[PDB]
Amino acid sequence: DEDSGLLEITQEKTGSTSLAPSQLIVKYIDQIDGAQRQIIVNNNAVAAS
Amino acid sequence: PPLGFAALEERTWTVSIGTDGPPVVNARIVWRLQGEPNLVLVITGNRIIAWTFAPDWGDSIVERLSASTNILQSESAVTQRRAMRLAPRREFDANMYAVDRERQLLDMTLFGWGARIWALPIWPDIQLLHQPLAAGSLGIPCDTAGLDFRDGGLAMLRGEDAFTYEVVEVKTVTASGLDLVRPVQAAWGTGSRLYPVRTAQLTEQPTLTRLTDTAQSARVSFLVMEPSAWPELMPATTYRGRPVLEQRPDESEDLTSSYQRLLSTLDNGSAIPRVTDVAGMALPVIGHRWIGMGRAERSAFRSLVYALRGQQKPL
Amino acid sequence: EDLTSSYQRLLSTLDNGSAIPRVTDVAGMALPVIGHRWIGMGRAERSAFRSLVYALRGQQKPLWVPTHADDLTLVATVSQLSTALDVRNIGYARFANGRPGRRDIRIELYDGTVYHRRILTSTELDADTERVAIDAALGRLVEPTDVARICFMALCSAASDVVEIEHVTDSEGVATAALTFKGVRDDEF
Amino acid sequence: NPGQPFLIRSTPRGIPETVVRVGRIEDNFLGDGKITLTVVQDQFNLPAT
Amino acid sequence: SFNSRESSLADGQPVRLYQFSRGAIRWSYNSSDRDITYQNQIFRTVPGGITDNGIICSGDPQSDQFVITAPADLDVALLYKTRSPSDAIDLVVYDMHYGDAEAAVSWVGQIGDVDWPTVDSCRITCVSEDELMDQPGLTDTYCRTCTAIVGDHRCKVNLVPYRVTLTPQSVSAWVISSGVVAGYADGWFTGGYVEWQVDGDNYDRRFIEQHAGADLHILGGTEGIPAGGQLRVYPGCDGLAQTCDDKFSNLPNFRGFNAMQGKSPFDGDQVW
Ligand SMILES: [Fe+3]
Numbered sequence A: 001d002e003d004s005g006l007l008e009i010t011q012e013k014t015g016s017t018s019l020a021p022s023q024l025i026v027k028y029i030d031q032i033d034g035a036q037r038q039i040i041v042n043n044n045a046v047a048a049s
Numbered sequence B: 001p002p003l004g005f006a007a008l009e010e011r012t013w014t015v016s017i018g019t020d021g022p023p024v025v026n027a028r029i030v031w032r033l034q035g036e037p038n039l040v041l042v043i044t045g046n047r048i049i050a051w052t053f054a055p056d057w058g059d060s061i062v063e064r065l066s067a068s069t070n071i072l073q074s075e076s077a078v079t080q081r082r083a084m085r086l087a088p089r090r091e092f093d094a095n096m097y098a099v100d101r102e103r104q105l106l107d108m109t110l111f112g113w114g115a116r117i118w119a120l121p122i123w124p125d126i127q128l129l130h131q132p133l134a135a136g137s138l139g140i141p142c143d144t145a146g147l148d149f150r151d152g153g154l155a156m157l158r159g160e161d162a163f164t165y166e167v168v169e170v171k172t173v174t175a176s177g178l179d180l181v182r183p184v185q186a187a188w189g190t191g192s193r194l195y196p197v198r199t200a201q202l203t204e205q206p207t208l209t210r211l212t213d214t215a216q217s218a219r220v221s222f223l224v225m226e227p228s229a230w231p232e233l234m235p236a237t238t239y240r241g242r243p244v245l246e247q248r249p250d251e252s253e254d255l256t257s258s259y260q261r262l263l264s265t266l267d268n269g270s271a272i273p274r275v276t277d278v279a280g281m282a283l284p285v286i287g288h289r290w291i292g293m294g295r296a297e298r299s300a301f302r303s304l305v306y307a308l309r310g311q312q313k314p315l
Numbered sequence C: 001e002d003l004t005s006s007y008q009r010l011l012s013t014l015d016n017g018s019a020i021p022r023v024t025d026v027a028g029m030a031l032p033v034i035g036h037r038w039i040g041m042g043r044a045e046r047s048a049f050r051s052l053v054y055a056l057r058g059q060q061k062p063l064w065v066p067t068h069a070d071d072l073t074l075v076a077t078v079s080q081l082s083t084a085l086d087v088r089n090i091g092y093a094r095f096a097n098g099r100p101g102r103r104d105i106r107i108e109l110y111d112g113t114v115y116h117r118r119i120l121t122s123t124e125l126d127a128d129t130e131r132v133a134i135d136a137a138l139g140r141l142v143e144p145t146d147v148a149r150i151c152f153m154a155l156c157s158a159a160s161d162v163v164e165i166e167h168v169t170d171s172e173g174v175a176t177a178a179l180t181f182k183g184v185r186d187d188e189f
Numbered sequence D: 001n002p003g004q005p006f007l008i009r010s011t012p013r014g015i016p017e018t019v020v021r022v023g024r025i026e027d028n029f030l031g032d033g034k035i036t037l038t039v040v041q042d043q044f045n046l047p048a049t
Numbered sequence E: 001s002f003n004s005r006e007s008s009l010a011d012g013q014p015v016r017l018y019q020f021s022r023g024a025i026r027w028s029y030n031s032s033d034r035d036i037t038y039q040n041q042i043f044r045t046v047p048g049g050i051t052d053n054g055i056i057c058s059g060d061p062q063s064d065q066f067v068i069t070a071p072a073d074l075d076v077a078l079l080y081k082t083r084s085p086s087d088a089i090d091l092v093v094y095d096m097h098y099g100d101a102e103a104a105v106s107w108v109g110q111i112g113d114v115d116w117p118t119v120d121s122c123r124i125t126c127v128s129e130d131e132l133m134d135q136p137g138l139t140d141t142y143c144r145t146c147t148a149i150v151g152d153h154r155c156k157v158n159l160v161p162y163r164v165t166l167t168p169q170s171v172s173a174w175v176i177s178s179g180v181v182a183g184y185a186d187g188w189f190t191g192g193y194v195e196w197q198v199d200g201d202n203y204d205r206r207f208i209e210q211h212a213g214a215d216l217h218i219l220g221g222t223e224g225i226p227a228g229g230q231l232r233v234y235p236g237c238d239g240l241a242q243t244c245d246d247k248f249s250n251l252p253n254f255r256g257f258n259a260m261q262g263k264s265p266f267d268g269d270q271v272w
Helices: A043-049 B101-111 B293-308 C043-056 E001-005 E075-081 E128-132 E242-247
Strands: A023-029 A036-041 B022-032 B039-046 B064-065 B071-075 B078-083 B090-097 B118-121 B154-158 B165-173 B177-182 B193-202 B209-212 B215-224 B256-260 B281-286 C006-008 C031-039 C102-104 C116-118 C155-158 C165-167 C175-183 D007-008 D015-028 D037-042 E014-022 E027-028 E036-038 E041-045 E055-056 E064-071 E088-097 E101-118 E120-128 E165-166 E175-177 E193-199 E202-212 E215-217 E231-233
Touching: B101 B215, B118 B154, B118 B215, C043 C165, E001 E088, E014 E036, E014 E041, E014 E101, E027 E075, E036 E088, E075 E101, E101 E128
Parallel strands: E027 E041
Antiparallel strands: A023 A036, B022 B039, B064 B090, B071 B078, B090 B215, B118 B193, B154 B165, B154 B193, B165 B177, B193 B215, B209 B215, B256 B281, C006 C031, C031 C175, C102 C116, C155 C175, C165 C175, D007 D015, D015 D037, D015 E055, E014 E027, E014 E088, E036 E041, E064 E120, E088 E101, E101 E120, E165 E231, E175 E215, E193 E202, E193 E231, E202 E215
């Protein structure tokens, strides 16, 4: 804290939300056969916006 | 060197150590004889030249005590202190003159010795002997109350002229005299000056101004390269476990006060500025002046300054 | 206007930390700095000074700059063939024992004749007197009563290139200027 | 040390008690006495399902 | 009290201690103006002071260096003036406050580089163990030679029986000559190294370009070799299987592949 050992905080970096992805593709290798495989991860909330 | 030693004979040579030579004494004298491993007598030490010029006392001599303490404060008015140098560096500023036989000696010394360690006597600590000092006597009975005398230090007797002087090593302080290890080889009667000696170096070579054919006034400034031990004592009064400054400041020069604040982030654009109180607290600033008119008060002030350690210790 | 002198040194690398500093002599040599002023009161002197300034070309061209002090005073007459000048002990041997700077002499007799000599080595003789040596001869027998000053010589060059010639009345009139000279190691060494 | 999470509070800035993870470290023990840290909000977690 | 003093707002008396260690020899220095005794070790005071620039831990070895500034006459740094010591000088940094007997370890590492920008100062760049991870890690090749330095943990060859202790006959700028080695076949010592005691339990090592008769060729010159000091010389392995077994009889540990295959694939064009 300011009185507990903090001097000054300068950077804030509020960031943004409208940007950033809505769908993510992950590619992995299955060691049983060594064939390329992929899975899909979706962000419905961000996708709608 | 080749000379036989008689049986049951002890030959004691006289090792005379001069005053002229390289600054660092790095000597290795080898006593080599047949059928015996080399027995090298190693002599080590340093060569220094003492400052033997009396500066006139028309203008006050300024003594400066400086220390380093980098302090960083947060948004709130809270400070953490990090006193760096335990022994403050001491600087001396004074003016001097040289007319008869001292101008040429000063010029030669400055040209030759230049930027090298000196043995600066403490001019403010001048002292006059009360009784004559016999040649070869061990111990100088003199006042040592509130003086810059330390065990294993140096002392420098002086006469009317620059030449009349001699430096001795003080072992300890008995509160009435100066224990000495080496006898004094010349007797000076009442009137000869006694000066504490501390190592010093020329911070900047003085700019000599010619007054006449043989006359030059110099503004010599010296800095001591040895810690200056001194007792640290605070004022007797105590309040909430802290010292209290009971001294009344001198009013000879008018003094004012101010309320310093961390009032940054004024944020001035083009239309109108707006100042925000980061902490909303005021830390007053006060000035102080005092007059010694005595050895005891000056010693107490020096102890207070040493105890302060810059901005570290509050009161 | 009162003038002073200083011993400028390359005394950098003080290396100050927190506990204690320590200064090291990179060269262990002192180069003196001397100031100079003059009055013209004539066209010829002003022309000569302008020629000197042009010849200097700033700090480039050096030239000896004798002092005007009285550092050394004789205490015993010296024969013409003798090279054992005796002077009052001013710690010269311990400080000055032969090295660039403060090793030149101008006798400057009463009549006006001046002899330029070159110190070779100084030896301590007594707590009050010394026997500083010279290079070759003196010219004649001179008693201590027939010496004005010694005024150690030293090679020096200008310290500031800019020179201000303050014209007051006219070309045929008074003028004032100030010059500063600093020692420099030159003359083939 | 790097990766160590800790809390920071600064009422004037309007930042409540927040959990952040240490990033780049640059400290100056002697001289300036400045200890400056770069931190990020704690949002790292590996779900088991 | 160290932590308490750090949290203290009025007792801050920082003092940084450096400890340079090389085996049985230790060098102790402090940044204050007086010597400090800690753990029965006294730290010398350097005229002019010793100071650093700060500690950075950003995860990048190239950027997280530690810089030390000290005079040019520093004893530990003086060794690097002529030739870098064979062994690395480990450095440990402590932090303590004057009047307290407790100290905290801050930085640990070894000397990375040393230079003397000015006669009155010297700059030392200290690197951490993390920087040793930038070099490759393949360390494997299917070649004919052994691919192993004689005496390494892979060769498993004991060089102590082959140690030869001798006093050199004559030392030149690039060649050190001794008659004892003249009794060995040419090239016997090729690839070996010479080690001799410098101080305490630390030795300096030098490789050998070639051995011929009574003359030994030293890579990089013979500077720093004592003319009368005792020298230990070890042989060298060429790496060939015949060389490995005839001389050292270490064929079972031979890591090379002499005649297993040079190119032969099983998916080529024509076997004949
Ligand atoms: Fe092998």
